[PDB]
C-alpha cells in the first residue's frame, strides 16, 4: 500500500525535474513558458512516448536495438540511418555534460556532509548581498571566471570529484548491478520523493523581506501574454518535455526492446509519462523557483537561471537548506540522493552508445564501455574548462536536437512505416484502447506542429546563432558536428563490414 505508493513515486525523479526544469522556466519567463510546455505535453510528449514504446518493442521483436537500424527497418533508405544517427548523438552528447553535473551534486553532497555550507550574510537583508555568498559557493566550486573569460578554472576538489564520478560510472558499467541497484534504488527513490515533498511543503511557508514564496508559484503559473510569440520559448518548452520524459533519447527505445510484443504499452506508457509530469511541475517546479523568488527576488532568480544551465538549484537549494532544521544534514541527504538519481540516468544515456558498439561493428562489452567512457571523459574537459560550452551542448542536444529527432521518429514510424500499421503496433496488448483523436493528432497535428515550430524557430534564432563569438563556443559547435560525422562514420563502417563477407 504505502510501500507500493512510495515505490511508484520514485520511478520518475530525474535531475531534469530538479536541476534543469527550473533553469529552463526561469530563462524563459516562467508561466509564459508553461502554456507552450503544457500544450507540447498534450500534443507532443504523450504521443511520442507511446511512439517510442511501440518502436522499441517492435525493434526488440526484430533485434536491431539502435535507432539507425530500427529506422532502417522502417524505411529502407541510406538516409534513414543518418537521421537515425541523432539517436546516438543526442544521448552521447547529453552524457558528456550530464556526468559533470552529476559530479557537482556529489561534491555538494560531500561539502554538506562535512558541514562546509553557505550561510546567509548575517543582518545584511540585501538581496544582492544575500545572493553573493550562495553564488560564490557554486562559482568557487566550478570556478566561474570574471569578465566572460574563455577559460573556466574549476577547483581541484571539483576535478577530483569528477574523476571519482567517472570511476564510479565506469566501475558500474563494466560489472553488473547487485548491491547498489535494487537494494539501494528502492530506498533512495522513496526517500528522495519524501524529501522533495517535504521541501515543497516547507518552501511554500517561506516568506521573507525580499519577496514571498507564494509569489514564486504565482509567477510560474501566471501566463505572460507577451512571450508566447517567442519561438525560443516554444522550442525550449518542447525540448524540456523531451528531456524530462527521456522521450527524445534512444535509451527509452532500447530499454523498451525488452518488453514483449503482447505486453500493454498504452497504459504503462501513459502512466510513466503522467507520473513524470506530476513528478516535476508539482515538486521540482514548486521548490527552486518559489525559493529563489522568495529569497533573491524575481530579477535575481531570472538572471541566475539565464547565467547557465543547471546553476539555479546549486544556489537556490543550498540557500534554502540554510535557516532550516538540520539543514546541513538534510542537504547532504538531498544531494547524495540527487547524485544517485543522476547516476541511474547517466548509465542509461550511455547505454545507447554501448549497445550500438556491441550490436553493430561487433565489439565486446569491455571495448564498448571503455571506448564510450573514453569519449565522455575526454570530451567533458571541454564542458568543464570552456566557458559557455556546457550550455551550448545542453542547448543543441537537450533542447534543439531532441525535437527535430522526435519529428524524425514520428515521420519514420507513422508516415513511412504505416499510418495504420503504426496504430496497430501501438494498440496490440493495450489494457485500454488509444483515444480515437490521437490517430489524427499523431498523423496530422503533431508533425505539422513540430515542423512549423522548427521553421519559425529558425531564421528567428539562426542569424543570432551566427552572430555569437565567445571564441569558446565555436569550438563546441565544430566539435559536436565532428562527433556527429564520426558516428555517421561508425554506421558506414558497420555496413561495410557486413557487406564485405
Amino acid at each position, epitope marked *: 500500500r504505502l510501500g507500493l505508493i512510495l515505490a511508484m513515486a520514485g520511478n520518475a525523479v530525474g535531475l531534469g525535474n530538479f536541476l534543469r526544469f527550473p533553469v529552463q522556466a526561469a530563462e524563459n519567463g516562467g508561466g509564459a513558458f508553461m502554456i507552450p510546455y503544457i500544450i507540447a505535453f498534450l500534443l507532443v510528449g504523450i504521443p511520442l512516448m507511446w511512439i517510442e514504446w511501440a518502436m522499441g518493442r517492435y*525493434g*526488440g*521483436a*526484430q*533485434g*536491431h*536495438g539502435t535507432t539507425p537500424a530500427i529506422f532502417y527497418l522502417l524505411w529502407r533508405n541510406r538516409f534513414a540511418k543518418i537521421l537515425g544517427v541523432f539517436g546516438l548523438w543526442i544521448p552521447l552528447v547529453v552524457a558528456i555534460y550530464y556526468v559533470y553535473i552529476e559530479s557537482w551534486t556529489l561534491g555538494f553532497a560531500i561539502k554538506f556532509l562535512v558541514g562546509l555550507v553557505p550561510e546567509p550574510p548575517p543582518n545584511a537583508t540585501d538581496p544582492d548581498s544575500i545572493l553573493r555568498p550562495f553564488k560564490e559557493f557554486l562559482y568557487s566550486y566550478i570556478g566561474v571566471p570574471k569578465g566572460d573569460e574563455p577559460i573556466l578554472k574549476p577547483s581541484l576538489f571539483a576535478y577530483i570529484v569528477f574523476l571519482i564520478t567517472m570511476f564510479i560510472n565506469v566501475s558500474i558499467l563494466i*560489472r*553488473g*548491478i*547487485s548491491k547498489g541497484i535494487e537494494r539501494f534504488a528502492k530506498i533512495a527513490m522513496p526517500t528522495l520523493f519524501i524529501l522533495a515533498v517535504f521541501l515543497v511543503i516547507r518552501v511554500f511557508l517561506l516568506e521573507t523581506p525580499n519577496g514571498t514564496a507564494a509569489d514564486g508559484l504565482n509567477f510560474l503559473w501566471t501566463p505572460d501574454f507577451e512571450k508566447l510569440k517567442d519561438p525560443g520559448v516554444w522550442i525550449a518548452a518542447v525540448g524540456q518535455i523531451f528531456f524530462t520524459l527521456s522521450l527524445g533519447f534512444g535509451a527509452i527505445i*532500447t*530499454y523498451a*526492446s*525488452a*518488453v*514483449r510484443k*503482447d505486453q500493454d504499452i498504452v497504459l504503462s506508457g501513459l502512466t510513466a509519462a503522467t507520473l513524470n509530469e506530476a513528478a516535476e511541475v508539482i515538486l521540482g517546479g514548486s521548490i527552486s523557483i518559489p525559493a529563489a523568488v522568495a529569497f533573491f527576488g524575481v530579477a535575481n532568480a531570472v538572471a541566475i537561471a539565464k547565467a547557465g544551465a543547471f546553476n539555479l538549484g546549486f544556489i537556490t537549494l543550498p540557500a534554502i537548506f540554510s535557516q532550516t532544521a538540520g539543514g546541513t544534514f538534510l542537504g547532504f541527504l538531498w544531494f547524495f540522493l540527487l547524485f544517485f538519481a543522476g547516476l541511474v540516468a547517466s548509465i542509461a544515456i550511455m*547505454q545507447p552508445m*554501448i*549497445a550500438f558498439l*556491441e*550490436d553493430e561493428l*561487433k*565489439l*565486446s*562489452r569491455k571495448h*564498448a564501455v571503455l571506448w564510450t567512457a573514453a569519449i565522455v571523459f575526454f570530451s567533458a574537459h571541454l564542458v568543464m574548462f570552456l566557458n559557455k560550452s556546457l550550455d551550448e551542448m545542453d542547448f543543441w542536444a537537450g533542447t534543439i536536437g531532441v525535437v527535430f529527432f522526435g519529428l524524425t521518429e514520428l515521420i519514420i514510424f507513422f508516415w513511412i512505416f504505416g499510418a495504420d*500499421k503504426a496504430w496497430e503496433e501501438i494498440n496490440r496488448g493495450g489494457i485500454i484502447k488509444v483515444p480515437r483523436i490521437y490517430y489524427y493528432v499523431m498523423r496530422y497535428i503533431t508533425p505539422a506542429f513540430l515542423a512549423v515550430l522548427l521553421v519559425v524557430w529558425a531564421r528567428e534564432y539562426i542569424p543570432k546563432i551566427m552572430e555569437e563569438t565567445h571564441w569558446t563556443v565555436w569550438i563546441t559547435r565544430f566539435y559536436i558536428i565532428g562527433l556527429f560525422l564520426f558516428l555517421t562514420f561508425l554506421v558506414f563502417l558497420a555496413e561495410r563490414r*557486413r557487406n564485405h*563477407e
Partner: antibody
Framework: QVQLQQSGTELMRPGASVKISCKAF????????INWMKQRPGQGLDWIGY????????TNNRKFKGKATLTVDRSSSTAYMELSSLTSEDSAVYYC???????????WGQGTLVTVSA | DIVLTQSPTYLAVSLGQRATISCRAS??????????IHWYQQKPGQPPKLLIY???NLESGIPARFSGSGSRTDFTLTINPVETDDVATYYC?????????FGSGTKLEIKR
C-alpha cells in the same frame, strides 16, 4: 564475440532436481531474451521456454510448464534453468540460445547433458 | 499450436547439384507481410547453426549457397551448389505464433 557457456554433464536419481547455469559473455546481458530448448540425441528440438533478463518474467511452453523453472542472476550475467521431478525421459541435451532481443536464436550454447538414472 | 511438417525426412544429393528442403505450416507464418520461418544447420556434436532468417534473408558467416524462399504456408530452403561440410540435420522454425515450434528435421547426406 558472444559466448554462452553451460555447466556440463550431470547425473541424477529420478525424482530429484537440478539447476543448469548458462553463463553469458561479451554482450550486454539485460538487452536480450534468453531461450531454453530441449533436444534428444535422435529427436528434433523442443522449445522449453524463454526469460527476459532485464525484468525476469519467464514464459514456458505448455509441455514443460511444471518441469522447468527459469531464473536469472543479473550480476553474474547468467541464466538458470531448474528441472524438477526428473525422469529418464528428461534425459537429453539442453541448449540456451539468445536471439537478438528475441529472427531467433542466432547464438547457441555448447549444450548441457543430463542423464537421469540411479 | 502451429505444427511444422517437413518434406523428405532423409535426403541424399550428389556434389555440385542443388538440394531443396521444404517446410509446411498449419497456419500462416506471415504477420505484417513477413514470413517468420527460420533455418538451422546442425551437425552432430554441435548446437544448431542459424542459416536464414525471415525465410528469405541470408545470415552472415553463411555462404551465399544457402538461399531462402517461399511464403504463406509453404517454404523452401535451397542449397546450391551443395558442399561436403553441409552434411547435417536441417531444421525450420516458426516464430509467428507463440509458443515457438520446430520442424522434425531433414538429414542431408552426400552421394559419394
Amino acid at each position: 564475440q558472444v559466448q554462452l557457456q553451460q555447466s556440463g554433464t550431470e547425473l541424477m536419481r529420478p525424482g530429484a532436481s537440478v539447476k543448469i547455469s548458462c553463463k553469458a559473455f561479451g554482450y550486454t546481458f539485460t538487452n536480450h531474451h534468453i531461450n531454453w530448448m530441449k533436444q534428444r540425441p535422435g529427436q528434433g528440438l523442443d522449445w522449453i521456454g524463454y526469460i527476459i533478463p532485464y525484468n525476469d518474467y519467464t514464459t514456458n511452453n505448455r509441455k514443460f510448464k511444471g518441469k522447468a523453472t527459469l531464473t536469472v542472476d543479473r550480476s553474474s550475467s547468467t541464466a538458470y534453468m531448474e528441472l524438477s521431478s526428473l525422469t529418464s525421459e528428461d534425459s537429453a541435451v539442453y541448449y540456451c540460445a539468445r536471439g537478438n532481443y528475441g529472427a531467433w536464436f542466432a547464438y547457441w550454447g555448447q549444450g548441457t547433458l543430463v542423464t537421469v538414472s540411479a | 499450436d502451429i505444427v511444422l511438417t517437413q518434406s523428405p525426412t532423409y535426403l541424399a544429393v550428389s556434389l555440385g547439384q542443388r538440394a531443396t528442403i521444404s517446410c509446411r505450416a498449419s497456419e500462416s507464418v506471415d504477420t505484417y507481410d513477413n514470413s517468420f520461418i527460420h533455418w538451422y544447420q546442425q551437425k552432430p556434436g554441435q548446437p544448431p547453426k542459424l542459416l536464414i532468417y525471415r525465410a528469405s534473408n541470408l545470415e552472415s558467416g553463411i555462404p551465399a549457397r544457402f538461399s531462402g524462399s517461399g511464403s504463406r504456408t509453404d517454404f523452401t530452403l535451397t542449397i546450391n551448389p551443395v558442399e561436403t561440410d553441409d552434411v547435417a540435420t536441417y531444421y525450420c522454425q516458426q516464430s509467428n505464433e507463440d509458443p515457438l515450434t520446430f520442424g522434425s528435421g531433414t538429414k542431408l547426406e552426400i552421394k559419394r
